[PDB]
Design a protein around this motif. Structure first.
Motif, mmCIF file in Angstrom:
data_model
loop_
_atom_site.group_PDB
_atom_site.id
_atom_site.type_symbol
_atom_site.label_atom_id
_atom_site.label_comp_id
_atom_site.label_asym_id
_atom_site.label_seq_id
_atom_site.Cartn_x
_atom_site.Cartn_y
_atom_site.Cartn_z
ATOM 1 N N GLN A 1 12.091 6.656 -33.391
ATOM 2 C CA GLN A 1 11.426 7.956 -33.579
ATOM 3 C C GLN A 1 11.709 8.887 -32.430
ATOM 4 O O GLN A 1 12.034 8.464 -31.333
ATOM 5 C CB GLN A 1 9.865 7.732 -33.591
ATOM 6 C CG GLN A 1 9.399 6.880 -34.723
ATOM 7 C CD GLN A 1 7.897 6.566 -34.658
ATOM 8 O OE1 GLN A 1 7.344 6.339 -33.593
ATOM 9 N NE2 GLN A 1 7.249 6.524 -35.796
ATOM 10 N N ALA B 1 -1.411 5.596 -28.446
ATOM 11 C CA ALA B 1 -1.070 5.131 -29.793
ATOM 12 C C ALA B 1 0.025 5.970 -30.444
ATOM 13 O O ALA B 1 0.688 5.477 -31.364
ATOM 14 C CB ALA B 1 -2.273 5.143 -30.714
ATOM 15 N N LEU B 2 0.147 7.239 -30.046
ATOM 16 C CA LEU B 2 1.177 8.170 -30.606
ATOM 17 C C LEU B 2 2.400 8.216 -29.803
ATOM 18 O O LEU B 2 3.286 9.010 -30.181
ATOM 19 C CB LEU B 2 0.546 9.545 -30.806
ATOM 20 C CG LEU B 2 -0.516 9.562 -31.875
ATOM 21 C CD1 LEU B 2 -0.964 11.033 -31.934
ATOM 22 C CD2 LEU B 2 0.037 9.158 -33.248
ATOM 23 N N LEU B 3 2.617 7.412 -28.752
ATOM 24 C CA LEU B 3 3.951 7.383 -28.123
ATOM 25 C C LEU B 3 5.009 6.907 -29.197
ATOM 26 O O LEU B 3 4.797 6.044 -29.981
ATOM 27 C CB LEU B 3 3.891 6.433 -26.942
ATOM 28 C CG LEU B 3 3.208 6.989 -25.716
ATOM 29 C CD1 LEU B 3 2.848 5.858 -24.741
ATOM 30 C CD2 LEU B 3 4.041 8.018 -24.982
ATOM 31 N N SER C 1 3.444 -0.789 -28.825
ATOM 32 C CA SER C 1 4.206 -1.860 -29.496
ATOM 33 C C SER C 1 5.464 -2.192 -28.797
ATOM 34 O O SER C 1 5.972 -3.329 -28.837
ATOM 35 C CB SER C 1 4.415 -1.489 -30.957
ATOM 36 O OG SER C 1 5.203 -0.315 -31.129
ATOM 37 N N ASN D 1 7.977 5.239 -31.024
ATOM 38 C CA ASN D 1 8.749 3.990 -31.099
ATOM 39 C C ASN D 1 10.252 4.271 -31.030
ATOM 40 O O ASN D 1 10.666 5.394 -31.080
ATOM 41 C CB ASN D 1 8.363 3.308 -32.390
ATOM 42 C CG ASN D 1 6.933 2.836 -32.428
ATOM 43 O OD1 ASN D 1 6.431 2.360 -31.391
ATOM 44 N ND2 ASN D 1 6.304 2.792 -33.609
ATOM 45 N N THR E 1 5.689 13.819 -35.022
ATOM 46 C CA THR E 1 4.814 12.716 -35.453
ATOM 47 C C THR E 1 4.443 11.786 -34.251
ATOM 48 O O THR E 1 3.545 10.922 -34.366
ATOM 49 C CB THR E 1 5.533 11.772 -36.501
ATOM 50 O OG1 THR E 1 6.635 11.093 -35.889
ATOM 51 C CG2 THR E 1 5.985 12.448 -37.737
ATOM 52 N N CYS E 2 5.102 11.970 -33.142
ATOM 53 C CA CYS E 2 4.881 11.189 -31.922
ATOM 54 C C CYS E 2 5.128 12.000 -30.710
ATOM 55 O O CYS E 2 5.707 13.090 -30.775
ATOM 56 C CB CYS E 2 5.743 9.915 -31.930
ATOM 57 S SG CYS E 2 7.565 10.211 -31.900
HETATM 58 C C1 LIG Z 1 4.966 2.212 -33.788
HETATM 59 O O1 LIG Z 1 5.114 1.060 -34.581
HETATM 60 C C2 LIG Z 1 3.961 0.349 -34.737
HETATM 61 C C3 LIG Z 1 4.297 -1.071 -35.221
HETATM 62 O O2 LIG Z 1 4.895 -0.825 -36.386
HETATM 63 C C4 LIG Z 1 3.108 1.259 -35.597
HETATM 64 O O3 LIG Z 1 1.882 0.562 -35.823
HETATM 65 C C5 LIG Z 1 2.802 2.557 -34.871
HETATM 66 O O4 LIG Z 1 1.993 3.425 -35.649
HETATM 67 C C6 LIG Z 1 4.117 3.202 -34.591
HETATM 68 N N1 LIG Z 1 3.943 4.443 -33.829
HETATM 69 C C7 LIG Z 1 4.157 5.661 -34.290
HETATM 70 C C8 LIG Z 1 3.938 6.799 -33.375
HETATM 71 O O5 LIG Z 1 4.386 5.835 -35.492
#
Ligand SMILES: *[C@@H]1O[C@H](CO)[C@@H](O)[C@H](O)[C@H]1NC(C)=O
Ligand SMILES: *[C@@H]1O[C@H](CO)[C@@H](O)[C@H](O)[C@H]1NC(C)=O
Ligand SMILES: *[C@@H]1O[C@H](CO)[C@@H](O)[C@H](O)[C@H]1NC(C)=O
Ligand SMILES: *[C@@H]1O[C@H](CO)[C@@H](O)[C@H](O)[C@H]1NC(C)=O
Ligand SMILES: *[C@@H]1O[C@H](CO)[C@@H](O)[C@H](O)[C@H]1NC(C)=O
Ligand SMILES: *[C@@H]1O[C@H](CO)[C@@H](O)[C@H](O)[C@H]1NC(C)=O
Ligand SMILES: *[C@@H]1O[C@H](CO)[C@@H](O)[C@H](O)[C@H]1NC(C)=O
Ligand SMILES: *[C@@H]1O[C@H](CO)[C@@H](O)[C@H](O)[C@H]1NC(C)=O
Ligand SMILES: [Ca+2]
Ligand SMILES: [Ca+2]
Lengths: 498, 503
Positions: free
Chosen positions: A259, A252-254, B404, A256, A265-266
């Motif tokens: 980022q 879940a923390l990979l 995502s 985006n 934060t990731c």
């Molecule tokens: C990546 O984006 C998704 C969809 O917006 C979000 O829910 C998720 O928390 C994001 N990931 C990070 C690490 O912030």
């Protein structure tokens, strides 16, 4: 006077192969002197203080103290140690002696919280593994019987961490030393615990490695664990009541696309894989179970203990000075092959993993075991695997084990200390929240031993400095605590053990 | 006429390495004949609800290997090509899946996977037959099927699809990982990927249980007691006291609860000895190998009723015995009861034709626009659903793509209340075949969801499944897109799909 009888008792002491340093009278209301504590506690009671060394082999010896209160309850108590120490736990001595116990503590065979005194000295190891603690019991009981005409009736043990291990070593190997044993967050499965501690640096690397996870990243990891896992127990309270239910998905923390992991934060894939390793059990050669995972929820303090990219001292010392006799050995090179060598060695069965408690059971002993769910030093899962091991080794059901051995996972509790939840269970001054037996595990054990009234739960308080915000009844394992209402999660009766 | 075109097609087929046995026109409303289905695969019925041109052929794959395959070219043709897959160590064309797809108008293929029957004995002394099974039969059927489809229909085909589960789920993932140009859309269920270690894990169960006389053995009635205790401990973790463990990851059962009390005997079937609890704990443990390396996840709790037969009954596990006899050791007398992690290390290093199917880098399929919908049932007694979750995480972390990001092309849906490629007791009917059919809305039919995703760009945010009583829909539930968890929150009953939230 009690004082005069104390201040001339030195002449009566008759312990063999010992060196009495002092016998002093300590009044109520002083800060207890600490000149024998190597490089303050205000007494609320008077006592006779005996300090001495006892020789334990041609190459080893202990330092110990006995605190014999004026307001004596007829009960004997031993404290224990922490880490690889080395250090008497004066805090716990004061805790117990305040309740009128004839109380002892030893340095565990050396001074200092480190392994250097083990090097080329197997006898100092033997002291650390069992012999120092048991010597302090034997000698303390001799002193107590010499000082008080009435002697002692029941004998108790209070200790956490290495002290938890020491209490369990007593139960398993010296069943007659204690009638009641209160054992917290135990360092049993000691060799594999120590190996597990070394393993962390092999997973993280140093601070420059692509596998390294920064402290700000561990905080993000922590927050995401809370998000995924807090509410599983029914209460959205920021606490993972029972981490067994928490199997976090760190992916879940990979990051985006917009980022960067440098933001904290990731995480990268490699970093996620480090974290997954933290949350995985350790297996050895031949695919044997070595040590459980770190339980999720201990991240904030686990950064300091294990994840920061530096060698874990206790393991470094154990492997250098006990396993390999190589003062230069680089703990970063740890492997499961190393662990197998250390396991084969198991000096003096310091593993402390015997699951057959029959001798202690049959002599009427009672043991109350606890562990905090946010423990960043010794995973709480180790204690649950141990409970299952006792049950399956003895072929005794939980309700059968309850006659003599009860175990209480504590939510919101750190390593032998409060965390952020209802952790103050009376295992020491730092966790004190009252003298009802249900609120104080030491006094619950006296009630169990002397009146037969067994703890069905261990109640803990969430303190704000000195004020009780709320309490929670921690369930008797294997039951799980779940929040059902209708009251707030601060209402202890809005929880049920199922 | 279509029928005339079918009747003149055999003479037009001219495919390398192919021997065409028959071309037949099959009308709607008739039992589809099974002359070419050998007894070992059930011999001779499915009644067609559509007309088609049926081509049966062999295709040689080496000097000592070949496949049997069929292509079903419907008269009501949608412009779409589809391949089915196999099951077990078979060996058998999945005619049920072929009819499922051909009824939607797909030009449909299936192969026998390079031999006949669900067993590994055709692996004996024949690496080429193993190669067929590992990848090459399925791929050959695709290449040859596409040629036949292009030859028969003036318009050819546009998009290419895959539908399979179990072995068939592995086959779909092998396609994604190794033949990214074979399919535009892949629907892969309960996959037998991590195949070598899956097979080893199967062999491990007997080593834990012993035979029916061993002190370690847990009887069927004891396994039902274990099951009921697991439901006790774990049902409500998802919020709903519905008899279903929605996400078994939260279920970490304490089997010691079933140790006998002093007036009870394990001969009752209601309680367990310490040794028997240790057996059960081993079933619910991950398997690790030499050097302490992860081999296979635990069996997920909840699958006990059917897992007694598949694994716990005290008998050798055929698939693993055949694999180790004929592929690993080349010794027909090898005794699977002797299985060890050292045996698994040998097998893993062999990895014939990368049958492991564990490649986590899906960039080639992603780049060519492919989509993959993966699912797995939470009550699977054959292939632990945790294997699919570990795989998902492996893809994310190997590609360095967040969930995502992966959602652009790869989405995965744990399905509560579902067995191995079949319905169990919950809302399991998701449209992955005739046996799980619950309608043609794309949200309720994973095949049609994939068509929608590839052709219209509308990806599945959830997979809805139905709890059926015969053909009556009792209720539905939207199964969340992993990694989100489905939690029951009310205010409605747990039968109200709106009373659940993905978090
Ligand atoms: C990546 O984006 C998704 C969809 O917006 C979000 O829910 C998720 O928390 C994001 N990931 C990070 C690490 O912030
Ligand atoms: C007592 O024994 C310790 C080792 O346990 C040794 O360091 C010390 O010199 C001895 N004497 C003391 C503390 O007075
Ligand atoms: C310690 O790990 C070794 C593998 O090195 C294994 O043989 C042993 O069972 C483990 N002991 C415990 C108590 O987990
Ligand atoms: C079949 O294909 C081969 C190779 O392309 C070709 O030589 C042969 O002429 C074809 N047969 C007919 C009848 O067209
Ligand atoms: C086709 O190939 C199979 C092996 O995959 C073989 O057993 C069979 O004899 C061949 N011919 C026919 C008609 O099925
Ligand atoms: C199996 O063993 C035989 C000898 O019995 C050998 O000739 C053959 O190469 C081996 N491997 C096979 C058949 O895949
Ligand atoms: C054993 O007794 C306890 C306490 O009565 C009960 O809760 C438990 O279910 C019993 N165990 C078995 C296997 O019936
Ligand atoms: C299969 O098990 C072996 C043990 O030899 C290990 O090396 C390998 O990583 C495992 N593979 C997977 C995909 O879990
Ligand atoms: Ca909570
Ligand atoms: Ca449920």
């Amino acid at each position: 006077s009690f004082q005069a009888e104390c201040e001339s008792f030195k002449a009566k002491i008759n312990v063999t192969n010992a060196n009495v340093h002092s016998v002093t009278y300590v009044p109520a209301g002083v800060n207890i002197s600490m000149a024998d504590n190597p490089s303050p506690i205000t007494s609320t009671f008077a006592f006779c203080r005996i300090a001495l060394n006892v020789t334990t082999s041609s190459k080893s010896q202990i330092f110990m103290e006995a605190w014999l209160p004026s307001n004596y309850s007829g009960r004997f108590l031993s404290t224990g140690n922490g880490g690889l120490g080395g250090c008497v736990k004066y805090d716990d001595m004061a805790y117990a002696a305040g309740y009128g116990f004839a109380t002892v503590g030893t340095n565990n065979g050396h001074f200092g919280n480190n392994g250097v005194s083990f090097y080329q000295n197997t006898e100092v190891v033997e002291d650390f593994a069992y012999r120092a603690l048991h010597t302090g019991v034997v000698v303390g009981k001799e002193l107590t019987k010499n000082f008080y005409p009435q002697g002692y009736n029941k004998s108790y043990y209070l200790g956490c961490s290495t002290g938890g291990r020491q209490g369990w070593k007593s139960v398993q190997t010296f069943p007659d030393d204690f009638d009641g044993v209160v054992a917290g967050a135990p360092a049993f499965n000691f060799i594999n615990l120590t190996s597990w501690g070394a393993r962390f640096l092999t997973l993280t690397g140093d601070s420059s490695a692509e596998t390294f996870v920064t402290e700000t990243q561990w905080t993000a990891v922590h927050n995401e664990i809370i998000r995924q896992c807090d509410s599983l127990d029914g209460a959205k309270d920021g606490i993972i009541e029972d981490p067994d239910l928490c199997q976090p998905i760190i992916e879940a923390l990979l990051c985006n696309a917009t980022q960067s992991s440098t933001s904290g934060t990731c995480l990268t894939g490699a970093q996620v894989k480090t974290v997954n390793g933290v949350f995985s059990a350790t297996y050895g050669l031949n695919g044997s179970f070595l040590y459980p995972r770190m339980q999720p929820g201990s991240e904030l303090a686990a950064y300091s203990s294990y994840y920061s990219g530096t060698p874990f001292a206790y393991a470094e010392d154990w492997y250098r000075y006990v396993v390999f006799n190589n003062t230069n050995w680089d703990v970063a090179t740890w492997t499961v092959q190393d662990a197998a060598i250390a396991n084969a060695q198991d000096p003096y069965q310091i593993s402390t993993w015997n699951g057959d408690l029959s001798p202690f059971q049959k002599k009427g002993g009672k043991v109350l075991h606890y562990h905090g769910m946010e423990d960043a030093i010794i995973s709480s899962e180790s204690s649950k695997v141990y409970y299952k091991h006792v049950a399956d080794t003895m072929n005794l059901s939980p309700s059968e084990l309850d006659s003599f051995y009860r175990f209480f996972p504590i939510s919101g509790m750190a390593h032998c200390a409060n965390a952020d939840g209802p952790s103050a269970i009376g295992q020491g001054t730092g966790t004190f929240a009252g003298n009802n037996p249900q609120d104080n595990v030491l006094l619950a054990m006296v009630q169990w031993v002397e009146e037969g009234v067994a703890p069905d739960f261990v109640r803990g308080a969430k303190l704000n400095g000195s004020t009780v915000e709320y309490r929670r009844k921690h369930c008797k394992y294997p039951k799980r605590n779940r929040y059902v209402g209708p009251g707030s999660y601060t209402d202890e009766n809005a929880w049920e053990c199922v």
